[PDB]
Design a protein around this ligand. Structure first.
Ligand SMILES: [Fe+2]
Ligand SMILES: [Fe+2]
Ligand SMILES: [Fe+2]
Ligand SMILES: [Fe+2]
Ligand SMILES: [Fe+2]
Ligand SMILES: [Fe+2]
Ligand SMILES: [Fe+2]
Ligand SMILES: [Fe+2]
Ligand SMILES: [Fe+2]
Ligand SMILES: [Fe+2]
Ligand SMILES: [Fe+2]
Ligand SMILES: [Fe+2]
Ligand SMILES: [Fe+2]
Ligand SMILES: [Fe+2]
Lengths: 157, 161, 161, 161, 161, 157, 162
């Protein structure tokens, strides 16, 4: 088929965000593992792979609509140094996704591309779950302090 | 059969208390899980299911006595915000249960409804065990502080799915 | 995050409806089991547990939106005596759910809370399935009569336990 | 190869009859399942799939004879509302099949298309079995009445899915 | 319940389209199998069974809305003779489906029948996937030619049993 | 028992055709395997063994009717050289069977030897299936060409 | 510890090349699967994941040397439309890899960071294996033609399943 160019622009924009999220989450995961934050890195890594699944779902639909998936562009990768900064950086990415998905759902349904809208709806629910994890961990960091929090994730390995 | 009206009232009062405890314990479990207090939420949730079995036992006995089990009323559900408040609130529920069940057992045996008394006797021992856990946790919180205590119950997961 | 207050009001209203439905369906199941309506009670009981799943899904989303899930309020629990009344009562509850869910999906989508809308959309499909079961059972009762209908659900079992 | 045009006309006519029967039996099964006539719907559904096997066998033979299988035409689908009407409608379809198959076997054998005749002979035996089931169920409905008969096929299940 | 007449009409129109697609896809699968296009027939046949599940889902929803599912009407079944014509014909069916479903979803949501809309939404995604395969195969045929393309789907078997 | 001599003549004539078909299909199968037409030879060989089953069924009935099965006579074995010729030769054999079975069914049923008629009816359906395979392959050869068709059946072995 | 800045610059440049290759190979695999070139897409995809291992090995070493792995920069992603173009594009990426790794190995050994050199030596052999496959397929396409070659990789499935 051939999609609506504005719908394809939306898919490619979210695709750029996922590729950005993949790099950010993967690098944070490697930073946390290297700092010895074993249990936390394991979670961040899996979040990275989930963004890859989002990228592949978007790519599939872009191709079905006869668009060219954008694998060249990246947004600015946020790199945190402390555990608090890493969660805050990753939360910022998911907050931009939310808005980048909400607006896309309204256009896609207005232009009747319901299947593309549902791709965004599913990603939106996932991103909302992840931000909930990030904000829950940040609340934990505020209550426990960074050291006590970090103490729960390190592993003699 | 047809129960003694005062006995059925005692059973229905405890049933109201269980329905309240189910909601209170379930919401505390969900609140703790949402705050990332993983291992603690698992325990609070299981306690919620205990009160559900208590509710079903009470309901069974009321029907056998030909009464109408009360599924309409709730007492005031106490919602804590900190971990201490949650344990204190749930302790309050179990304190009233312990008082209500003991008074009911004496009346039920006085009116010769021995089987109804034994239902309360079984629930009472359960409620006493639960209050013992709550008071034990509160003692741990006082000794360790909320943060160190919470540190032992968190797990990399923290979900709302 | 923080939801739109009207959206949370919708979620909390439906949560109130589910908690009512849980109590109504569970009591009907216990009433039916006590009357010896064995196979029918098994189904009504399972319907109760489905409403618990609806309640838990709603509770999760309310917490994610930083609201306070309402475990204090119940609507009026409708209690039937005959099989026909029980089905009619449970049908009335699902009719009110279906109306409120349609209203919420439109508001949630207009305010862009698509994830909350989809939570309602899934519950709505379940409630529509359930009302369809109730109306089909009601049609059977009209065709067979209560006695002949009840004869298909009786089983050699005990009342209490 | 290339068949006798009249033989292919016979095969295509029966294929039209089967495609009609598939639709009629499947819709009756879905109608019966929706009314809660569970065990009866399972049987009617299986009857539908048998007619699909008849359709596929006929289609294969038409292609071997280099004809064009007719998937465009349907006869009038008879839709009953009561159980009695549904059985009467499905019986009417099998009566017309049985008459046409006997006519085709004689023509096919006279024109020496023995393999086509045997395709009809096998379908005829199946349709005769099916009409025998319908008439036996109809006799039961007359003896028991619709309500008592329906009571033997009801089951604790859902309408849709 | 009782559906909106326009919603039930949309559902029945798509149901007519599925019944047409089932016949069209099944006959193409049988025609390809009879021509020895073994691996391709297996795929076309499976697509036929997808449309049957679509038909059953639509039928289920129409009955829940108290409509009469239309098992009487077929649209024009498009029959190709070459491999290209068959893919082009089946693409045409999916083009109309995609148009019909999108218009129906907007109306169904406008009339607040959200569950009916979601049935169409699920079918739409399936139809879009199928058209994507058809257009992909057509591109392969244009690049390779019919003969080379066919060479990849033939197997020593070529049956009509 | 004792069969009708005309019925036994029919059985023995079809038996001669099967013994002929066995040799023809077997030799074609060996020719195709020797030319490296691996997947095709496997099919032709199995068709050969099916004609053997026909021969045995005919022999059994001839013996039941107290006739002497003819294992001495053969019709002319057609040997093709190209793939097209082999299919055309085997199709010719099955076309003669069809006619040799149709006429036999009418006589056997007229003379009331229904069981012998049914032996022919079963063979007729099998032969009709086989000719359908032959004509389908020939149509494939016409559409693809001999080389492209042969390319689908060869095996490094 | 702390590596030599020039070594870390070499590692980060190869890391950029790997991130470029992951995207390039993954998109080629998705393009080929979407065109129905089933068996070939399977191969290109696996090549994408192998480049992911290279990135993870490179990231690990950069972190050990207390550098900041660069996950921000990409080289130009080459997207071909025909099969030949896709193979030619992927060969171009590997050709730049071979040159960069050889200079890095010599510098890394001269500066006594032998472990970093061996990381490059291992990747170097993998890239050479991959280039040999690409040139072999390109030779097959030249002998067979694009159409005949493509016929050997297609399978009845050809979707965009998600
Ligand atoms: Fe994502
Ligand atoms: Fe209790
Ligand atoms: Fe309850
Ligand atoms: Fe519910
Ligand atoms: Fe609950
Ligand atoms: Fe059908
Ligand atoms: Fe039939
Ligand atoms: Fe069929
Ligand atoms: Fe469909
Ligand atoms: Fe032999
Ligand atoms: Fe034979
Ligand atoms: Fe990636
Ligand atoms: Fe690499
Ligand atoms: Fe990656």
């Amino acid at each position: 088929m051939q999609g609506d160019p504005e719908v394809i622009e939306f898919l490619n924009e979210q695709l750029t965000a996922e590729l950005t999220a993949i790099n950010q989450y993967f690098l944070h995961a490697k930073l946390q593992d290297h700092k010895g934050w074993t249990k936390l890195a394991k979670y961040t890594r899996a979040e990275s792979f989930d963004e890859m699944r989002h990228a592949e779902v978007l790519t599939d639909r872009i191709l079905l609509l006869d668009g060219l998936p954008n694998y060249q562009r990246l947004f600015h990768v946020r790199v945190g140094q402390s555990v608090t900064e890493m969660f805050q950086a990753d939360r910022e990415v998911e907050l931009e996704a939310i808005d980048r998905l909400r607006r896309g759902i309204e256009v896609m349904r207005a232009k009747h591309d319901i299947t593309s809208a549902n791709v965004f709806e599913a990603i939106l629910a996932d991103e909302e779950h992840h931000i909930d994890y990030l904000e829950t961990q940040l609340d934990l960091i505020e209550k426990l302090g960074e050291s006590l929090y970090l103490s729960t994730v390190i592993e003699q390995t």
